[PDB]
Design a protein around this motif. Structure first.
Motif, mmCIF file in Angstrom:
data_model
loop_
_atom_site.group_PDB
_atom_site.id
_atom_site.type_symbol
_atom_site.label_atom_id
_atom_site.label_comp_id
_atom_site.label_asym_id
_atom_site.label_seq_id
_atom_site.Cartn_x
_atom_site.Cartn_y
_atom_site.Cartn_z
ATOM 1 N N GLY D 19 3.224 31.146 7.146
ATOM 2 C CA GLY D 19 3.331 31.012 5.742
ATOM 3 C C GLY D 19 4.167 32.078 5.216
ATOM 4 O O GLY D 19 4.283 31.971 3.763
ATOM 5 N N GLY D 20 4.522 32.964 5.839
ATOM 6 C CA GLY D 20 5.284 34.153 5.326
ATOM 7 C C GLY D 20 6.722 34.634 5.989
ATOM 8 O O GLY D 20 7.262 33.604 6.786
ATOM 9 N N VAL D 21 7.267 35.556 5.649
ATOM 10 C CA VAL D 21 8.480 36.072 5.848
ATOM 11 C C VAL D 21 8.590 37.237 6.539
ATOM 12 O O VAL D 21 7.732 38.405 6.296
ATOM 13 N N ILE D 22 9.069 37.161 7.690
ATOM 14 C CA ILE D 22 9.384 38.296 8.619
ATOM 15 C C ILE D 22 10.760 38.771 8.133
ATOM 16 O O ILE D 22 11.949 37.890 8.367
ATOM 17 N N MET D 23 10.945 40.119 8.013
ATOM 18 C CA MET D 23 12.500 40.515 7.556
ATOM 19 C C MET D 23 12.835 41.766 8.596
ATOM 20 O O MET D 23 12.210 42.507 8.952
ATOM 21 N N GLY D 231 7.061 29.143 9.206
ATOM 22 C CA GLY D 231 7.371 30.555 8.570
ATOM 23 C C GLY D 231 8.778 30.662 8.696
ATOM 24 O O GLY D 231 9.434 30.011 9.481
ATOM 25 N N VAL D 232 9.307 31.606 7.864
ATOM 26 C CA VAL D 232 10.690 32.226 8.174
ATOM 27 C C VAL D 232 11.093 33.578 8.748
ATOM 28 O O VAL D 232 10.160 34.547 8.243
ATOM 29 N N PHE D 233 12.189 33.908 9.447
ATOM 30 C CA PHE D 233 12.509 35.275 9.751
ATOM 31 C C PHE D 233 13.787 35.206 8.737
ATOM 32 O O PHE D 233 14.762 34.271 8.675
ATOM 33 N N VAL D 234 14.061 36.431 8.174
ATOM 34 C CA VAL D 234 15.208 36.526 7.472
ATOM 35 C C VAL D 234 15.778 38.037 7.842
ATOM 36 O O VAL D 234 14.921 38.815 7.831
ATOM 37 N N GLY D 235 17.033 38.199 7.931
ATOM 38 C CA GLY D 235 17.532 39.447 8.275
ATOM 39 C C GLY D 235 18.883 39.780 7.414
ATOM 40 O O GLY D 235 18.706 40.327 6.255
#
Lengths: 191, 290, 288, 290, 289, 194
Positions: D19-23, D231-235
């Motif tokens: 449910g979250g974002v990893i940056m 969930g999502v990974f964003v860079g």
């Protein structure tokens, strides 16, 4: 019976083979901790400078000397011999400095001059000595028993617990010298 | 009776190099840094592989002056590297007292069909290989030591990994293979069967095999050991780095303590800038052997 | 000491200059011995018949082999099918003097030949070129022969093979030492064998002609081209008068440079086996 | 009797990230911005994927110094990452205390044939995939979490969408598939059958699967959730944007409220300039896994 | 009473090792086979060489014939079925058949999916050409394996190819670096878990027999020499001149496969063997998936 | 200590494993000659008909009996048991006929009925997993025979001095207790002959 091999660099695996082939247990020593509980130690052929440089950096020098003081037999082949020597030609200070001998590094020349030759070893005849960029023993103290010579050069010597040679027995299939060392260990474990 | 140039002596010299790092050096300063860092030998050349790449042109045996220079500066063995097939270059390096010759694909090959007949020399040779067939051919020519080829000067271990993995896997197959299948195996591999038979008899490869090509970090160095290398060659990754002297110590120490991950982590810590390297998308470079 | 390379190969060196004849029974074997054969190869069907009948060709019934052994004082050869280790062990157990791991029989292993090194009894193998020859030697073969095209009555293939092998030997013998490893690779050969060849100045095993030898001229031609001897199967027992053929081949083989004599020996022969041109889709050349 | 490194623990850690974002972060400042914005974790690296692309060269594990730096800066988990096949890099990151290792195709692969045997580690790994076969192979190797591969640094979700769609569609097929057809399915997919059996038994994929690659806008982020990402990974999309800090909050909030279009619309409002991105017409980049 | 355990299914095959299983079309044959020392009999409508020669669709045997065979012997009775034919297998199971052979010599019923052998109590044997194929059958629940060969040809070449392949691939996997298995599995088309089991165990976890073209005592002993656990023989005994004599010889050679004097003796009086077929066949056999 | 396994057919390899696992030496016996110098013999699971057929053909019958007469312990598993039995239901004549027992072949049915079940074995212990693969059963036991185990009121394991027998196949399990128990008998027999 537990024999260490100083495993920082060099022909470690070869000694292990001999040790195991003579029925003892081999232990590769890259750390002081690994010295504990060992009945004897082997200092293998390789690059003495490299071995020293690594011994320094990981504080093995003192623990090795303590290991010697404990009366544990030590077998030095080529570089191994160099590590044991009290005096090294061209060197203000030695490495372990446990054997009353003077050694000259690279005394036969370079790799091109590396050679093999059959030897007569006092305690141990026709033993094929393999000399790979070998040093030689210039001078031996009174406490030291000369075990073999090549062309009037000392190439093998004993001093109580300490055993040393210029050549690399571990490169041959002939284990007589390894056996002879193991014996020393056996005798030593008792005291 | 002193016998020189025996296989035992040639190969033994390589067995005495195991567990260590051999460093490419272009001058005596570098050589001294290498000896100080704990290198087991130094490989003398005119340009470091990354520079060989970047400069292009024809890469030959180094000027003997430089080799002598390097020999005078250190007490560890001095290797150099020659062009493939270049018999005379090798004779020259032998005459100079070079301890081990590298018949090398990073130099521009002189003979695209035939390698040097290494058997005719007293000084040993190291050769590169990508697979057991290649290995066995070099051994049959008289090579006394081997290394992966990798892709030198790229800062990328992928090729060296491929090669080490391939060779090691093919050794394992041969060691446990049914005896009656070797002649046909040898043919499939392009190998001399006698070498495969020696491998099988012995239970392992009868010469030392080092990693080489793209080794850039302590982790890279320890990885090759983990994959079964007998030691590592490093050129570009130390002297194209930010602090060569600091890299050198770390690669040497990681190579030796390749299973101590806490230590390797520490040794990796302060390193700073490593050589940039090259992905791939190269049309022809390297893998020039036969 | 039995089963040494020297003994295995020596046995073949003792066959040189002679004719080895395929025989399906004791009568034939006696004719062959009488005619001067140096040995006899025992089988169920002669190669021409193997061709014509088709099906799967295996090792001969031991009974037949024993039968033949009992009938003659010359060596008896037989096989086996390529790769068939046990067949070979069986022939060995029977006392067979030389085993032919043969492409005329139906191959049992299409990838791996018998490890002939493990036997005491020697083997002969067929080849078309020096690479093939060297591989068989590396497997432990102690004698070689051309493959030819057996049962065709046509020497063309045997000639091709003898020529190829001999030409490749000559090249290796005088080749620059530093080129061997690369040669071996081109040939698919084991380098050690080429080295042995070069060191020795010749092939280290006997090499015979085999396949399609039909006439005294044929037999003498193979000697002329440098064969060490000849194998003959079909051309004698598919001929009009086997017994007469047999003497003629034997005598031509021995006196291969006496053209007057060969001419004489060729004279009265009468009908030879018809043979086959070619235009065969798959037959023979089954080795690896 | 306390047990570490159990599959349950490894996978659980991932279940706690849902449910979250990893940056992706290159330094502590960024890490703090990420934690502040609500990131559930941060992925530490030397260069952001868009820069890795633009710079080229060989991309390796980050300097441990940077990783420690990042660890010290935040109370949320720290991931990092390693090159494909690079066992020692992974051991190092593990020794450093990294919470999750990304065996990543954005770095330059170290082994082009064999991935890391992730089963041998205590710390868990996340791997990328394009389809269920790839997913199942990674899981068989010991991966404890998965992500789409996408095309990182492009600012383009198309690939991530393709992958999420493919994997989700193949799961659905397997879940409802006739039991007797699985062995043959596995073979067609290049999958390990046991994993497909586990999938079928469980009624879902047994590990968390995130979207990653080209997520650039709150709408992008909510779309992947809509397509069933965990969930999502964003860079690149956050730190190559005009105001990272503002993007970060918006992505996090859209990820969480992915069905609230009024909100997403609002969150998209003031954003300003997003990274330009790349169409395609790339010859070799990414999709490097096996 | 736990029945149908893998240990029981596999154990039954472990109890067949070292022996010969013979194809039989009737009770007379079955009795000859028992008398000759067969460890089991495989019941079918036509012997493979005949299946070839007749063509048409080859199915499960008439239950009557199976029952007939069962009543005639005290050794196990095998039969099997067409590939994929679940119901045939259930039928053979209901009849009390000891081991089912899901066989490529019959006309396959499902060209994409094999039977889910796990769901049965009675064990199955399957054919394979390589370790991938083997491992797939094992993952389907096969409890025993055999080479495929080329049945009814009287030619061992294929069986040799297969036994060699499988054995070589097992040796590779046993000594292979552990981290390379997943990638190996993929290359072979194998389920990795099976390769892992192989590696852990140090050998294949089921029995593997030679089958296809075994025609002479030498053929039989050869397969043992190449590492077979036992042999299946159909055509080569009952298409021979004297079945009863062949039978004894194959049995005795299989057992004393290293006694070449003995094998030589046993080969002596045999007389006529089936002619066989070279090759140059367009589509026959190797029908499995 | 040298234990023979009758290697004519059957689950030979499995026994070898157990024997070696208990520290003894295993010897595969396909020929009479191979009996010489052995301290005990195992008759493995397999096909009794096949084993008998082969025993006949190669004249192993008498030499086995001599081996028994020499007082050497013998362990029969399943078919192995069948070879030892004095009487076999439906059989006018037995095989070795060294054990005072009557056995019925294939008494539980066919392979479909093959099963595993935990057992209580007198000398050996408890919860021993018995694997019954087309197993026979012991109908009747003589007075000299000690019953070591039963399954549902059927005798499945028995001892008679030197002779040890069971219906099930212990060699298929990892549990070596029974093998050990046999080895003991061999040790006692070996020590006993001074």
């Amino acid at each position: 019976m537990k024999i260490g091999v100083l495993g920082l660099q060099g022909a470690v695996r070869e000694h292990v083979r001999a040790i195991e082939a003579c029925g003892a247990e081999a232990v590769i020593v890259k750390k002081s901790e690994q010295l504990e509980g060992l009945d004897g130690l082997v200092l293998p052929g390789g690059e003495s400078t490299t071995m020293r440089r690594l011994i320094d950096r990981y504080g093995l020098m003192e623990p090795l000397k303590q290991f010697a003081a404990a009366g544990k037999p030590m077998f030095g082949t080529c570089a191994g011999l160099i590590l044991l020597a009290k005096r090294i030609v061209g060197y203000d200070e030695p490495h372990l400095g446990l054997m009353d001998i003077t050694v000259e590094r690279n005394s036969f020349g370079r790799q091109r001059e590396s050679f093999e030759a059959e030897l007569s070893i006092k305690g141990v005849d026709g033993f094929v000595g393999v000399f790979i960029r070998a040093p030689h023993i210039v001078e031996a103290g009174d406490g030291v028993d000369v075990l073999a010579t090549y062309n009037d050069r000392i190439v093998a010597a004993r001093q109580g617990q300490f055993l040393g040679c210029s050549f690399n027995p571990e490169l041959t299939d002939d284990h007589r010298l390894m056996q002879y060392f193991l014996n020393m260990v056996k005798e030593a474990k008792m005291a | 009776m002193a016998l020189t140039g025996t296989d035992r002596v040639k190969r033994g010299m390589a067995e005495m190099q195991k567990g260590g790092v051999i460093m490419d050096v272009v001058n005596a300063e570098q050589a001294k840094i290498a000896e100080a860092a704990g290198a087991v030998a130094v490989m003398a050349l005119e340009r470091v592989p990354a520079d060989i790449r970047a400069a292009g042109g024809v890469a030959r045996m180094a000027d003997p002056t430089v080799i002598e220079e390097v020999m005078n500066a250190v007490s560890i063995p001095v290797m150099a590297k020659v062009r493939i097939g270049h018999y005379v270059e090798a004779r020259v390096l032998e005459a100079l007292g070079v301890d081990y010759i590298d018949e090398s694909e990073v130099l521009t090959p002189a003979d695209e069909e035939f390698h040097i007949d290494k058997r005719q020399f007293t000084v040993p040779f190291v050769c590169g290989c990508r697979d057991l067939g290649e290995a066995a051919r070099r051994i049959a020519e008289g090579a006394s030591m081997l290394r992966t080829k990798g892709e030198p000067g790229t800062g990328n271990i992928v090729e060296a990994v491929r090669h080490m993995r391939k060779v090691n896997a093919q050794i394992r197959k041969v060691v446990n293979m049914s005896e009656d299948e070797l002649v046909a195996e040898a043919k499939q591999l392009g190998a001399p069967v006698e070498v495969l038979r020696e491998i099988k008899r012995l239970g392992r490869l009868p010469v030392v095999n080092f990693a080489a090509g793209g080794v850039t970090t302590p982790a890279d160095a320890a990885l090759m050991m983990h994959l079964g290398a007998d030691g590592v060659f490093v050129g570009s990754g130390i002297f194209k780095s930010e602090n060569p002297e600091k890299y050198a110590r770390a690669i040497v120490e990681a190579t030796t303590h390749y299973e101590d991950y806490e230590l390797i982590a520490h040794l990796s810590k302060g390193l700073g800038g490593a050589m940039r390297g090259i992905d791939i998308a190269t049309l022809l470079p390297e893998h020039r052997m036969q």
